[PDB]
Design a protein around this ligand. Structure first.
Ligand SMILES: CCCCCCCCCCCC[P+](C)(C)CC(P(=O)(O)O)P(=O)(O)O
Ligand SMILES: CCCCCCCCCCCC[P+](C)(C)CC(P(=O)(O)O)P(=O)(O)O
Ligand SMILES: [Mg+2]
Ligand SMILES: [Mg+2]
Lengths: 313, 317
C-alpha cells in the first residue's frame, strides 16, 4: 500500500523538476552564450525602437526571445552543418554531444515561446504575437530545410539565383521579420519596415556566403558543400556557357566535403578567374546596399553603422 | 535597374514557398508515417472522448496534433539514441540524413502549434490551449534532456527509482497530458482524468523498458547498446549498490559503457539482471501493481472495460 500510495502522490502532482536538473540540461546553451554578438543584435533592436517606441521593459522581453531563438537556431545549424567552430570556439555539439544539444536547442524554442505571454495581457494582441512567432519559425524551417536538402542531395537539384533568394527570404529573413513584426504589433506609436528588414536579411546572408570564401582567399562552406550565393552563380554560369568540365569539377569538389586547403583554394580561384562569381557577388552586395544608401521608401546615420557591422549579428 | 526591380518585388512580398518545396521538406516525416501505431492512438482518443464529447471536427484536429508531435518526437528520439530501427523499419535519419530529419521533425512541431489555433476562435480558451501545448512541450524536453544526460554522463549520476519516475513523468507523461488537457479544456461537458493519464504514461514507459530486454531474453535489446538508464537497469544498479555487490555493480556499468551490439555481451548483462538482482521479475511485478491500481479502481478514483484492452495494448501506442 506504500508503493500505491507514492504512485498516487506522483500522479496527482505536477511533474517534479529541480533547478539542478535545469542547469544540467542547459549546458549546451550556456556554452554558446559565451560567444560574442549580443551587443550588435541589441544595438539594431534599439535603433529600430527609435521608430517603434516600445517601453524599455517590453523591449527587454523581445530581446530575450530573440536571443533564445537565435542561439538555439545556431546550436541546431552547427549540428546540421557538422560545423567544428562558431565565432572562433568549439561548437557545442562536439562537447556535450549531438543528442543533448538538439534537445536543449529545441527546449529553448519553447522557453522563447513562453516569454511571448509576458509581452501583454490583451488577449487579441497575444494571439497576434503568437501567430507571428509561429509563422516565422515555420518560415525559418522551410528555408533551412531547402538549404540542407540541396546540399545533401546535390546534384539532384541545382538551384538558380531566384530559388536561392526565395530560400534566403525564408531561412534568414525569418528572425529579422519575427523581431520586427513583434515590435510593430506592440508599437504604441510610416510604412511597414518589413521590406527593409527582408533586405537586411538578404544582404546579411549573401555577405556571410561571400566572406566565408573571401577571407580565406577556412572556407568552411566548401567543406560543408553549401549551395552559397557565389556557388549558385558559378554552377549556373558554367551550365549556361557550356563549361562542362568546370561545372562538374565544382560539383565534384563540393561532394568531397574536403578540408584540404589547396583543393578549397582551387575552387575559390575557379570562381575568381573562370566564372567571375566572386566579383559578381561583391557587386550584387554593393547593389543591395546602395538600395538603402539611395525616397525613404524602404527606410523609415546609425543605419550605415549597422550595415557595416551586419556580419557581427 | 532590372536587378533592383526584381529585389523590390522579392522584399515586398511574403516568402515564396511552393507545394513542391513542401513535399521535399516532408520526406523524412512521410517515411515514418508508413510505420504502424496510428490506429491505436486514435482508439485511445476516441475512447477518452466518450467522456469529453468534443464535436468530431474538433476531435480530428486534436488527433492531427497528437500525430504530428508524436511522430516528430520519434524522429528526433531515434537521432538522439542513434537507433537503426523503429517498428522493424529503417529509421528516417539513416535514409534522409540527420540534418534533414532534425529540421523536418522541428518543422512539424510548429505545424502542430499552428493546428492549435484552429481548435477555437474564443481568445480566452485559445490562450489556455497554447499554454497547455507550451507547458507540456517544455516538460517533454526536460524529461528527454535528463534521460539523455544520465545516459551520456554515466557513470557520473546513477538515478534512483524515485528520480527515474520523475523523469518519466516529464518525458512520457508530456504527450499523454497534453492530449488529455486539450480535450478537457474543449469539453462542452460539465474529476479530471490527468492522474489517470499520468499512470498510463508510467505504465507505458516501464513496459517499454521491460519489453526491450524481455523480448531479447526470449529470442535486439537496443537499450543496452544505447546505455539507457532503463527501469530494469535502474533497479539492477541500485540493488547491487545497496547489497554491496561491488563487482556486479561495476560489471553492469562496464557493459553499458561499451555501447555494444555484441549479442553475447548483451546476454551477459541480462544474466546479471535475471540471476543476480532479479530485476526483470521485479519489473514485471512493478508494472502489474500499477495496472492493478486501475483494475481495482471500483470507487472510480482514477477511472471516470475498453480500458482493459487499451492498457494491455498500451505498447502499440
Ligand atoms: C530586426 C532585429 C533583427 C535581429 C537579428 C538577429 C540575428 C539574425 C541572424 C541571422 C542568421 C542567419 P543563419 C543562422 C541562417 C546563417 C548560418 P547558415 O549556415 O544557415 O547560412 P551560418 O553561415 O552562420 O552558419
Ligand atoms: C491521451 C491520448 C494520448 C495518445 C498518444 C499517446 C502517445 C504516447 C507516446 C509515448 C512515447 C514515449 P518515448 C518517445 C519517451 C519512448 C522512446 P525513449 O527512447 O525516449 O524511451 P522509445 O523507447 O520508443 O525509443
Ligand atoms: Mg551554418
Ligand atoms: Mg528511444
Amino acid at each position: 500500500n506504500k508503493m500505491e500510495a507514492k504512485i498516487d502522490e506522483l500522479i496527482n502532482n505536477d511533474p517534479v523538476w529541480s533547478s539542478q536538473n535545469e542547469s544540467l540540461i542547459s549546458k549546451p546553451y550556456n556554452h554558446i552564450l559565451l560567444k560574442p554578438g549580443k551587443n550588435f543584435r541589441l544595438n539594431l533592436i534599439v535603433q529600430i525602437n527609435r521608430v517603434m517606441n516600445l517601453p524599455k521593459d517590453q523591449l527587454a522581453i523581445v530581446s530575450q526571445i530573440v536571443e533564445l531563438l537565435h542561439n538555439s537556431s545556431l546550436l541546431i545549424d552547427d549540428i546540421e552543418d557538422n560545423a567544428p567552430l562558431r565565432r572562433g570556439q568549439t561548437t557545442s555539439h562536439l562537447i556535450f554531444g549531438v543528442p543533448s544539444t538538439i534537445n536543449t536547442a529545441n527546449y529553448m524554442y519553447f522557453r522563447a515561446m513562453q516569454l511571448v505571454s509576458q509581452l501583454t495581457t490583451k488577449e487579441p494582441l497575444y494571439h497576434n504575437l503568437i501567430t507571428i512567432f509561429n509563422e516565422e519559425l515555420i518560415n525559418l524551417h522551410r528555408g533551412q530545410g531547402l538549404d540542407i536538402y540541396w546540399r545533401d542531395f546535390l546534384p539532384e537539384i541545382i538551384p538558380t539565383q531566384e530559388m536561392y533568394l526565395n530560400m534566403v527570404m525564408n531561412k534568414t529573413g525569418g528572425l529579422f521579420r519575427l523581431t520586427l513584426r513583434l515590435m510593430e504589433a506592440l508599437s504604441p506609436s510610416g510604412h511597414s519596415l518589413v521590406p527593409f528588414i527582408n533586405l537586411l536579411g538578404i544582404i546579411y546572408q549573401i555577405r556571410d556566403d561571400y566572406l566565408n570564401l573571401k577571407d580565406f582567399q577556412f572556407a568552411e562552406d566548401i567543406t560543408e558543400g553549401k549551395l552559397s550565393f557565389p556557388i549558385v552563380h558559378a554552377l549556373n554560369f558554367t551550365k549556361t556557357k557550356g563549361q562542362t568540365e568546370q561545372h562538374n569539377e565544382i560539383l565534384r569538389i563540393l561532394l568531397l566535403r574536403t578540408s584540404d586547403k589547396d583543393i578549397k583554394l582551387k575552387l575559390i580561384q575557379i570562381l575568381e578567374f573562370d566564372t567571375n562569381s566572386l566579383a559578381y557577388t561583391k557587386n550584387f552586395i554593393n547593389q543591395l546596399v546602395n538600395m538603402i544608401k539611395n525616397e525613404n521608401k524602404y527606410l523609415p546615420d546609425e543605419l550605415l553603422y549597422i550595415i557595416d557591422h551586419l556580419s557581427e549579428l
